[PDB]
């Protein structure tokens, strides 16, 4: 039985009040000038979705037009004022996508019209056109039939540039720790493993290599589902140790209070959190999430957000779009979220698909478009660790601190709890993975 305070689900044990972890005096932290900036946050800004699709198309059409190979772009509404002798390019939203034994049928829409696009079974760009999600913005080079079909010979994705200038080296080596899906309130939360991680952060390490990493750790990024929430799915009460949203954030803040002062924490919301029930999520609902807003070394970031650390862009998102990829693309699955993450980077959109349990807000501007090329992309949500480099960009899933729940077992989700990516800010790369799973 769920309860509501002003409409929001609030309720239906210890809150880590006693938890005190002090810094190891034996370890001295390397004095590095903290260079950080929130480069992008959601808060820095008839048909309900008309303005959203206009924004999405405009933004991604700009990214496509930056490809030197894309030329002779013509409006879809002008396609039969064009003779069948002229090779043209069209840019538009993938409204529908259907496979025949003879190829792929797309319904592509721009601001001037809609057109049926045919791509033959094995045009060298087929593998990519077969993977593209609907409501993504793409380009097609080909000829118009005058029967009503665009006979494409080339398919283009917004992509990431193959060539980008290398960044100048930093004065000192600095590390960033990536975590997500803590799920405080859940009986499956790896409480001991997380306490051992807080000890590790406070210089309580047993090797010289770990000691030189901990001394240089200045940033901690938390990519959503920081609490397990209330009324997220039917039967959730059977899994909750802390069945109160206020007490969940209070328990979380008591743990996160034990994070060293020399570490700057960047905390973003997820789908279990007390935040907007659609994406993008500006921040957390301050009425419920207040204890984390009061942490001295914490910065509440939006979902999504772009954090510039020492000149390196870290795009932080919860990971709702990974689900869109695994449902729509056969062959791509969890146990490896790295490849689905690459597809989102290539589409330059975090969650293009509409209709899923993925609620996309009918906002005036599309803030889910990856407008600028990041150095690192961090996502959570799927509860499985992975890391893959695509054209100099590091794609990484920060896993979870939650062991397999009753519900996860039923929907066949197998997590990899307590696997922590260690990022070298200079190269914006995962250099090590801390494994605290022995404590699960
Ligand atoms: N209803 C449902 N069916 C199937 N798969 C699901 C469902 N809800 C979540 N998930 C998956 C998505 C992630 O891989 C994992 C953790 O999501 P999180 O929501 O953070 O617990 O569970
Ligand atoms: Ca030793
Ligand atoms: Ca059973
Ligand atoms: Fe989660
Ligand atoms: Zn989630």
Author numbering: 152 to 163, 174 to 206, 225 to 619
Show passages lifted from the paper:
PolD exists in all Archaea, except Crenarchaea, and is a replicative polymerase responsible for initiating DNA synthesis at both leading and lagging strands5678. It is composed of a large catalytic subunit (DP2) and a smaller subunit with 3′–5′ proofreading exonuclease activity (DP1)5. To help resolve the uncertainty concerning the evolutionary origins of D-family DNAP, we determined the crystal structures of two large fragments of both DP1 and DP2 subunits of the Pyrococcus abyssi PolD. While the interaction between the two subunits is essential for the full activity of PolD71413, both DP1 and DP2 constructs described here are capable of digesting mispaired 3′–5′ nucleotides and of extending a DNA primer in a templated manner, respectively. Both DP1 and DP2 crystal structures were determined individually by experimental phasing and refined at final resolutions of 2.5 and 2.2 Å, respectively.
The structure of DP1 presented here encompasses amino acids 144–622, leaving out a flexible N-terminal region that is not evolutionary conserved and not needed for exonuclease activity. DP1 structure shows an insertion of an oligonucleotide/oligosaccharide binding (OB) domain in the N-terminal region of the large calcineurin-like phosphodiesterase (PDE) domain. The PDE domain contains five conserved phosphodiesterase motifs, which form the nuclease active site. Metal ions are tetrahedrally coordinated by seven conserved residues distributed in several phosphodiesterase motifs (D363, H365, D407, N453, H500, H563 and H565). To gain insight into the catalytic exonuclease mechanism of PolD, DP1 was co-crystallized together with deoxy-adenosine monophosphate (dAMP) that mimics the 3′-end of the DNA being digested. In contrast to Mre11, the adenine base binds into a narrow groove of the DP1 active site, contributed by the β8–α5 loop and α-helix α9 from one side, and the α8–β13 loop and α-helix α7 from the other side. The adenine base mainly binds through hydrophobic interactions with the side chains of Y415, V593, F589 and the alkyl moiety of K536. As expected for a non-selective nuclease, these residues do not show specific interactions with the adenine base, but instead define a pocket that partially masks the Watson–Crick face of the bound nucleotide. This observation provides a structural rationale to biochemical assays showing that DP1 exonuclease prefers mispaired nucleotides over paired nucleotides24.
